[PDB]
Structures are given as C-alpha cells and as structure tokens.
Give the backbone structure.
Amino acid sequence: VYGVMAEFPTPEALIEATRKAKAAGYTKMDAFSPFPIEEVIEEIAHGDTGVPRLVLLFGLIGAASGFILQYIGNLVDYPLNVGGRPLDITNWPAMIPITFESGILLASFAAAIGMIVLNGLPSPYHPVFNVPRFQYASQDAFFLCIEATDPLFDRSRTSQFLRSLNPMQVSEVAY
Amino acid sequence: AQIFPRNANLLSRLSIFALVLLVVEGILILGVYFRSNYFRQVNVAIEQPVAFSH
Amino acid sequence: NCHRNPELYVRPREEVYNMDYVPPSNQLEIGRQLVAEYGIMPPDQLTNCYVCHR
Amino acid sequence: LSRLMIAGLMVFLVLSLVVLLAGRL
Amino acid sequence: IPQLGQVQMLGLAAAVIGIGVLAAGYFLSPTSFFESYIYGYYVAMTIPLGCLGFLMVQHLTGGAWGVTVRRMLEAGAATLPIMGLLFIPIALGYFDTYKALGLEHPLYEWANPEVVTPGGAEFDPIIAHKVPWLSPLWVTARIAIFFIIWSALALTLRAWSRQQDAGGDAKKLATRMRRLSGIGVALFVITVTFFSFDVAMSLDPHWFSTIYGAHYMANAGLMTLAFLALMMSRVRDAALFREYVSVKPIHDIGKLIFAFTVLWTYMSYGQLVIIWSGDVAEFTPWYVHRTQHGWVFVALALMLFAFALPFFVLLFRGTKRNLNTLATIAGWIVVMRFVDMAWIILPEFREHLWDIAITDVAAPIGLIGLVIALFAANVQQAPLLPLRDPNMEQLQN
Amino acid sequence: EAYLLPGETYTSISAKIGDVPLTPPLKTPKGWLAGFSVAFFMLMIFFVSVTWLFIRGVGIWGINIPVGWGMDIINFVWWIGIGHAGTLISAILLLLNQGWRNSINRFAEAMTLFAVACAGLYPILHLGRPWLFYWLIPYPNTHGMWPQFRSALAWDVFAISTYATVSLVFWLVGLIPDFATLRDRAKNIWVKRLYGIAALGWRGSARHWHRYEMASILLAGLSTPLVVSVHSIISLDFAISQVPGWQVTVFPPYFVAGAVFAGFAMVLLLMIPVRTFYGFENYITLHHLDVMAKVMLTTGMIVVYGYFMEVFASLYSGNEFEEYLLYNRLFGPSSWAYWGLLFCNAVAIQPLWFKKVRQNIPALLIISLIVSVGMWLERYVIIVISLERDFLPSSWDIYIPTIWDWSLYIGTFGLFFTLLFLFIRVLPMINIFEMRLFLYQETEKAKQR
Amino acid sequence: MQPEWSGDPEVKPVFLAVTLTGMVAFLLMVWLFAFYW
Ligand SMILES: CCCCCCCCCCCCCCC(=O)OC(COC(=O)CCCCCCCCCCCC(C)C)COC(=O)CCCCCCCCCCCC(C)C
Ligand SMILES: CCCCCCCCCCCCCCC(=O)OC[C@H](COP(=O)(O)OCCN)OC(=O)CCCCCCCCCCCCCC
Ligand SMILES: CCCCCCCCCCCCCCCC(=O)OC[C@H](COP(=O)(O)OCCN)OC(=O)CCCCCCCCCCCCC
Ligand code: HEC
Ligand SMILES: CCCCCCCc1cc(O)c2ccccc2[n+]1[O-]
C-alpha cells in the first residue's frame, strides 16, 4: 500500500534497475543500500541537498554573534581597561578567534541538524521496515522502492514491472 | 516497523523537544534560585532578639 | 546601576535623612544638575574595581 | 505532531511562570 | 601551442615594458631601482618556488589535479637557474661594488661597514652581532647553495618525468621521484624559509619572525595556485586536456586555492595577533611601519580583497567548477598577492603610501613577464600531461 | 601495497566488524577484561588524585611563583594534541580524497573524543578554584561581569567547547548508519532499541545518502579549520604572552605539527594491538601503517623545522633573554628535557625515512612510544624551562613535580583507556560503511583497470 | 531537490511551533537575566 519494492543481489543490478525504472517514467522512488551507490543517487536524488545553504546561514549568524558578543561585552556593556588595549574597532584582533569558533560551532550544528531534519531521518518507524528481508539492507542487500505518491502507480502494474526487472524478491510493502 | 511501533516517530520528536525544554527549564530554575528573594534574604522580616520597631 | 547612572537616584544633599522625600516628575535634569554640582565622577571612575573591591 | 509541541510548550511556560513567581514568593 | 605562444609573447611584451620603465627609473633614482628590484624578485620568485613545492607535494600525494598540472609545475620549476642568474643585481647591490652602480649607501643594512664595524659612524650593535650570518659573502653563499639545491631538484624531477614519458618503466620511475620529493619537501621548507629570511627580513635586522618564510611559503603557494588556475584556463583547448582532463582537477585546484587563501590569512593573522598581544618593542615596529602613513589602508584592502572576497566567492561549488570564474578569481587573487608583497616589502623602503614610485610597479610586472615567458617556453618543450604515468588512472575519476 | 586485502564481501565486512561488539558479556575476551581492569585501577588512581586535589589545593603539585604552569599544562597540551590526528583522519583525509581513512577514522575519532575528554578536565583541575570554570564562559550573572575575551584562555574556552562538540557531532554522524548496522545485526530484542534510537531509522536511502555525504563533506571542511584553530589557540595561550620562550610566532603551525605528530604516534600505538588482536589485517594494512608513519615523518620534520626556527631566533637575536633561553635549554638544570627531546624527536625519526623501518611493526611501536615521550618533553621544554628563568634573575626557581601530578597523569591515562575499552566493547572499532563503500570503489577501480 | 517532508500539511504548523517555542524561551531567558533583579 505504501509502495512496491524489489530486492537485488548486487549494486550493479541496483544501478541497472534504477536506470530502467527512471527510463519508464517512474518518479518519487527511493533505493536502499548499506553504502552510497552514487550511480543511483545521480539518477534518483540529483539536485541540491539543502545542507550548504543552512551551513552558510548559521556560519554567518555564528560569526556575527561571536563578534557582537565580544564587542558589546568588552566595549559597550562594560568598558574595561586591560593591558592598555583599545576600546573600539582597533581591538579587532583578539575577537577573531571567538568569532571564528562561534561561526564553526553554529555552522556544524547547521550541517548536522539540517541534514537530520532535511532527509527526514527523525522517523525511526518507517513503512519500509515491514519487509522481513529489509533487516539485511545494511548487511549486503539492495532494494528499490517505488512509492505510492507516484502518479503512474498501481499495486499490480508496479509489481509486474519490478518482476520484469528480474529481481530477487518483490514484496508489496505496507504502511 | 520491524522493532519500533507506529508512534515511535512522534515519541522521538517529542523526546527531543522535551529534552530541549528540560535543559531550558533547568537553566531557568538555577537562575531563578540564584536570584530568588529566599536565597538573597530579600523582603523577609529578619527576626531580632528584641524585635525593635523602626 | 547607580554607579553608572547616578542622575536617576541623586538627591539634594539636604533631603538624605528625610524619609518623606520623593523624586520629582522629571528628575533627570535635576539629577544631572546635582551630579555636576557635587562633582560626581564618570562611570569609568565609579566602575573601577578598587572603588569597591580590595 | 505540532499540537503536542504546543501543549508541551504551554506546560513548560506554566511551570516556568510558577518557578519565577516562587522566586519572587 | 597557440595559447602557449600567446602567453609567451604577452610575457615577453610585459617584460620589455617593465624592464624599460625600470631602466628609465634607474637613471633618475638608482637606489630606488634596486629597492624596487628586490620587491620584484620577491614577487617573481613566488611562482617557480611554488611550482617546485607543489611538484614535490603532488609527487608524494598523487592526485588528478597533480597529474593535470604536473608538467606546468615542472616548467615553472625549471626556470630557477634563470632566477639564480637574476639574483645577481641584488648581490651586486649588497657587495662592495655598490658605488660603481650609482647606489650611494649599500642595499642592505648589514652591508654597511659603518653599521657592522665598531668605531663606525652608526655602529648598530644588533646588526654588528649578526655580522657573520648577515654578511654579503655568507648570504651569497647561502642563496647560491639554495639555487643549486632548487636547480638540481627541479632538473632531476623534470628529467625523470621526461624519461618516464619517453622510455622506461612508469612504476619504477615514480618511486624515485616520490623519494626525491620526500627528501625535497623538507629541504624545500628549510631552504625557502632561510631564503625568505636572508632576502626580505635581512633588510631590517632589528626585527625577527619565525613564522616568516613559512608565511612566504603559503604566499608563494597561493600565488602559483592561482597562476596554475589561469594557465589551466588558457590551455583548456589543446587536444590533450580535452580528452583526459575533466572538471574534477578544476574542482581540486579551486579547493586548493581556497584552502591556501585560508592558510595565508592564517599565517598572517597568527603573526599579527602574536605581535599585537605580546606588546614587545622588538616586534611592534614592523606593524607600526605597516600601519603608519597610509599602509593601514593597504592592510584593510588585504583584509577585504585578499581574504574576505576570495573566501566568500571560493566557498561556492560552482565558482571553482568553472574555469572562467576560477580564472577571474585567480586574476583577482594574483593582483591581491602583488598588493600583499607590496605591503610586506615596500614599507622597508618607501615609508609612505604616496612615496611609491613607478619602478615599484615596473619591476614585478616585468620580472613576472619574464617568468611567464620562461614558463611558456619550458612547457612548449613537453606534452602537457604525463600520459605514461601510474597516476593516469586518477584522471578517469 | 593495497589499503584493502582481496577476498572481502559486504556481508563479510559487516560480520567481521560488527561481531566484535554485540557479543554476550559472558563471551568477553580475557585480554579485554585484563586491559579494562588495569584501566579501572588507574581510574581509581584518577579519582583518588582528583579527590585529594580538591581537598587540599593545587599546592600538592610542584608549581610555584615563577613556574605557575607545570605538569598540569604539559599534560593538557599533550592530551589535547593527541586528538589532532584523529580529527585529521576524520576530516582532512575526507577533504583530500584519501582512501586510507576508511579503516582508521572511527577509532581515531574516538581517541580524539577521549583525549579531549581527558584534556578538558585539566583546565578545571588546575584552575585553583575549580568550581568557577563557568566564569570563563560568557554567562548571564547578577554582577554584570564578562570574560575578558582578549586573553587566549577565553579563546581556549570557545575552542575546546567547539572542538569537543563538533568532534562528538561528527563522530555520532559517522556512527548513525553503523548504529543501523548494529541494530540490524543484533539478536536480543532489547539491544535493538539501544542502537535503534541512535540510528533514528537510517534506512540506507539514496536520497538520505546524498544529504549524508554533503553533510559529511561540509563537516570535514568546517572541522579542518576548526582543528587548526583549536591547536593554534592552544599555541596562543603561550604565544600571546611576553615570556621569552613563549613569544615565538611560529607556534601556531608548530603546535599543529606537534599535535599531528603525537596524535599519529598514539594512533599507530593503538592500531597495532587492535590490528594484531582483532581480525583487521585485511582492513588495517601494512600500507595503512606505512602511510601513517609517512605522515609521522612529515609532521616530525615540521617540528624539527620549528626547533631550528627557535634556535635560529635565539642565535639571530641580540636579545640576552633569547640567548639565555637557548643557554638554559642547552645547559640548564632542566636541560635533560631538551636533550632527551632532541634525541626523541630528531634522532628517532631518521629511521622513519627508510622503507623497511616504516613497514616494520615493532620498530613502529618503539618509535611511536619514543615520540610520545619526546612530545611530553617538548611541552616540558616550552612551558617549564621558559617559566623557570625569566627576565629578573631574582625571580628564578626550579620546578620539581611532586607525586600528585604524576598520579593525575597516570589517572588520566586510565580514564582514556577506560573510555577506549568501553568504546571497543559496545561500538565497532572501524567504520562498517565507507569500507564496504571502499570495497565497492576498489571493485570499480578493478573494473576500470 | 525537494526535502523529505515537502507537501506535508504538518510542516508549517511544526515550524510555527518550533519558532514559537524558541521566541518564548528567548523572551523568558531575557526576562530572567535582564528584567528580574
Ligand atoms: C584568520 C581566520 C581565517 C578564517 C578561516 C575560514 C575558513 C573556514 C572554512 C570552513 C570549511 C568549509 C568548506 C566546506 C566544503 O567542504 O566545501 C566544499 C564545497 O561544498 C560547498 O558547497 C560548501 C559547503 C558549505 C560551506 C559554508 C561554510 C560556512 C562558513 C564558515 C563559517 C566560518 C565563519 C568565520 C564565517 C569543497 O570545498 C572544500 O572542501 C575546501 C575545504 C578547505 C579547508 C581549509 C583548510 C585550511 C586550514 C587553515 C585554517 C586556518 C585557521 C585560521 C582557521
Ligand atoms: C594539516 C593542517 C592543514 C590542512 C590543510 C589541507 C588542505 C585541505 C583542503 C584542501 C582540499 C584539496 C582538494 C582535494 C584534493 O585534491 O586532495 C585529494 C587528493 C586527490 O585524491 P584523488 O581524488 O585524486 O584520489 C587519490 C586516492 N584515490 O589527494 C592528494 O593528493 C592530497 C593533496 C595534498 C594537499 C597538500 C596540502 C599540504 C598543506 C601544507 C601547509 C603548509 C605548511 C607550511 C609550514
Ligand atoms: C609552496 C607550496 C607548498 C608546499 C608545502 C610543503 C610543506 C608541507 C608538507 C607536505 C605535505 C605532504 C604530505 C606527504 C605525506 C605522505 O606521503 O602521504 C601520502 C598520502 C597517501 O599517499 P599514498 O597512498 O601512499 O600514494 C599515493 C600515490 N600513488 O597522501 C595524502 O594526502 C596524505 C597527506 C596528508 C597531509 C597531512 C600533513 C600536514 C602537515 C601538518 C602541519 C601543517 C601546519 C599548518
Ligand atoms: C546609587 C544609589 C549607588 C549605589 C547602589 C551604590 N553606590 Fe557607591 N557611590 C554612589 C555615589 C553617588 C558615589 C560618589 C562618588 C563620587 O565621586 O561622586 C559612590 C561612591 C562609592 C564609593 C566611594 C569610592 C570613590 O568615590 O572613589 C564606594 C566605596 C562605594 N560607592 C561603594 C559602593 C558599593 C560597595 C556599592 C554596592 C553595595 C555601592 N557603592 C552602591 C552611589 C551608589
Ligand atoms: C567549558 C569549557 C571550558 C574548558 C576549557 C577552559 C579553558 C582554559 C582555561 C584555563 O585556565 C587554561 C589554562 C592553561 C591552559 C589552557 C587553559 N584553558 O584552555
């Protein structure tokens, strides 16, 4: 009901099946492998990931906040004479390290949390685990699921097409 | 689906949300305790051996 | 707070022991006037560490 | 579900205002 | 070969123009002729030293970018005997023959007998303390030994690569240049650091810096990386890079340029924050001289256009995957490296931003035109890429 | 040689890596039990030393008025510099596209995290008033006080916090499909949820793999300047001072090189027993040991260049304090540290040029141990000898460490090994994915000939 | 490419919930650390 998936023994057969499914016009499909095949992503996930925009945005936010915090704290909120050092923008050294570390911290937080949210990883319970042979999908097994959000999707026709792709096992996966 | 039940996604998202809220609430409780009138002995009539009346 | 903005809290030096004294409606102009009249030091001088700590 | 996020935020806000009022108790 | 001839005649014309304007300025100020020639030599040595350095780095760590730009690195590093021949005006400047060449007081402060001998007119005791190390004979011997090391290293690496292309085992004549590169990276680091010392920091012996020389290594690496990007954009239609070279060497070259822009501003900022935070009067006159009389504007331009602009335009994936955008960024980068060596060397002579002469722009432009012409003539003698190499499989990607 | 020996499949890689965890605790090896017993005994030594330090004071150590920084700061820089090579393998080798990171990065990044865990206590432990470490952090208080932020120790606060946080984040990101593999390979239903909630339902999706690879690339390209900035800041907490042994401007790349040097020494010293005690000769190879020793030789040569830079600065300067710094290092009361440093960091690296010595395993172990000892001696020479003799000769004294900072050093060794043994018990030592991906890449290379 | 949750009607409610939680927590921390005394 969620989709129809097929099992393949080798990543070359996974590559050939993903190329043949995309050539038939099937969109909104996913392939599952223990490692990034790449020769499948370039076809089924080609485009912008959305990670580096968030990384750049929160790195800029972190660098700006790290400069502004040091500036306000040492120069505006509490002007203290330490070591004869300047009380204005001439004190731009000894602001660069904390500025850079704040930018790196928020950019790496952006990379991690943005990847986890954007791939929709925070979904431990997925319909794809209903297949009893999906336990080996990180233990040398390869799958290709055509989801039910595809427009030219049918529970019998998609299964017949995946069987025509010569797989190991076709399972009609449920919610 | 093999191990975790259906509501595990909502449970995990609500667990992350509740952990962030619990960290914020702990920081807030520590700040309120270190600024509180009981801790700083503010607005409490401190008892004297004679109870002198200003 | 008062060592950096004393003009919000300074009073004629003759109304210090008066418990019935209230600050006026504006109070900022006369606070600056009393700071200039009594020679109250700038917040850098009043916010120096060895003013209080030792 | 966003409704459970809203309910948890309301519970956190109510408990935090109780904490602030107990700080000014 | 057509684009190589075009850049060869462009460098020949730029060299003719720069040497002509420099010789015109020599008759009006023979002192400032040699002071600008020192800065021009420091600019023009960033290319062949960096080519030898990345030739050994890519030999040790093989890569698609390494086999793409390896013959360009060999051609750039093969110009180092001519650079040894071109160091002779500086040596004649700091020798005892300075009077016959129009220069009134000798080119370096330690070539003054009145400074390095007791009982003299000046007698600076710090410079007189460095009298064996900072002497014309010892400095000439050290720089000549460095030229011998660089020339033997580059000629051996180029000869082994040409023998590998012509006849012999490709796997056997790769371990030899990998071992030579392994000893040559250490020899290159210590040799270039002491060369940068004795050429640039020996102008003012009152001030010393140990990150100097390695900062010059990062400067030379960034300069020749942007040089490699410009030349790689120029030779992109040459019937050898059309078949075997894809966008992944371009991406690797742009990533190396971005990484060493970050590395150059790291080596500049570390020295700046160390000298600024440790307020010792043995070190602070350097940044006083590099801040006073309008040099703070050049320092701010180095902050804004040599780091803040290439850091942000080289942070995007598409600007280093494209050779046209990479070449434009590389041209802006080599302009900013000209400005950076100006800010490093020219405060030792000019003292003011408005005291910069036309010889100070004629000498590096003409001498880098000579570098351009020699590099183009050397790369015209060989195929542009090592076809008979074990690391040719890295170009297939 | 090769970075992956032939005869491996994806299921064989998954079984051979994930079967060392997920074993029942009754089947735990006696070698692991003995090593964990030694680590727990030295962790008890750590607890005793920390308790006596908190009870009595920082005056149980040998630090005094001229030498206010001693073995506490030496062991701080040592333990924080151990983690640089693991961050290098996790990030810089991912940036460089080097295929030998795939079998050492998990253990090396775990070693980085545990070394930073050992080295983050050392500020709080040496602090003298240990419970006020949060005053160095910018936090809101009723005083209106701020940290100075012009000192390098505030930069150290930000750098150590960012290094630990981003290293832990990148390690957990690199563990999430390994968590999925362990969740798939587990047998008991209650240990499925131990790795299931840490894998978060990874599924191995190719759409998820694109975002995963982009996030790993950006985390590597943020963690390379992160780790360079962290070790530059740890150089700067001497280099911003006016101390004649410390006001040296080549310290940020010199400390980067010394940290990578000591890190790959510790990495080799802990790969070699792991390689010979677990069946990882196919994954961690002689080529892996050869290239790790090559990076050791390169970075040790850069540290030797830094020694030459300091000696050149002392000889080139007319400054009497630089001249006496060189004289004090050469012929002082603490010249044993400088001479043993020269032997352990210059003489012992000339064998590493040779190919047979680079391929030899016990020579590599001896060289790695000698390099670790000499790097401790390097940090002794930098801190203690420069603080011992200063500008005013009336303020000269000798730093003699007591038994308590040595006990704290042995205890932090025990804490590091306790965390490492817990890691090799409950988690795989090497990455299950990216090594089957390495096998696929080597298969594609063989198909491309 | 599109995100994983693209086309889900709960995405903008959960984004408003996260931003509302962030602004309430920010205002509450500002109140405690600046306007509490
Ligand atoms: C004196 C201060 C110096 C300031 C140093 C600044 C350096 C910070 C660089 C961070 C690495 C990000 C590269 C991402 C990436 O992997 O790029 C990919 C291409 O993929 C992308 O599209 C980019 C992904 C997102 C990038 C956004 C970055 C966020 C902004 C960073 C926040 C910092 C603040 C200050 C704004 C391929 O490109 C590469 O992999 C190249 C990596 C080069 C590594 C550089 C190594 C240099 C080491 C020296 C460090 C110097 C010290 C001072 C830090
Ligand atoms: C250690 C502190 C400083 C780190 C800075 C290092 C730079 C990191 C970012 C730059 C990325 C460069 C682009 C990627 C690349 O080309 O490298 C991978 C390359 C090619 O690998 P293949 O894809 O072709 O496949 C090979 C295996 N299958 O591999 C290399 O050859 C590595 C390149 C060497 C980098 C040289 C950097 C040296 C840093 C010197 C710093 C100056 C020190 C001065 C004292
Ligand atoms: C002016 C130009 C700049 C020149 C810079 C010269 C000084 C820098 C040192 C040179 C670095 C080269 C590292 C060589 C180490 C090595 O041999 O390893 C090679 C590996 C893999 O090689 P494989 O597998 O055996 O064979 C490949 C050929 N078929 O390649 C690598 O990429 C690993 C290198 C990682 C670099 C870490 C060292 C960085 C030094 C740290 C200090 C820097 C201070 C900021
Ligand atoms: C406003 C109501 C104030 C508060 C709250 C505190 N201080 Fe004050 N302080 C105030 C004034 C108007 C002055 C006059 C100084 C001047 O030049 O006009 C001071 C000064 C002091 C001093 C004198 C030191 C000096 O002038 O060099 C001390 C020792 C001092 N204040 C201590 C002090 C402490 C410890 C406070 C917190 C409990 C404090 N003051 C609060 C006004 C106000
Ligand atoms: C919450 C993170 C804070 C832990 C790091 C504290 C920073 C810190 C504090 C110190 O007092 C030091 C003294 C000597 C050397 C390094 C030091 N560092 O790094």
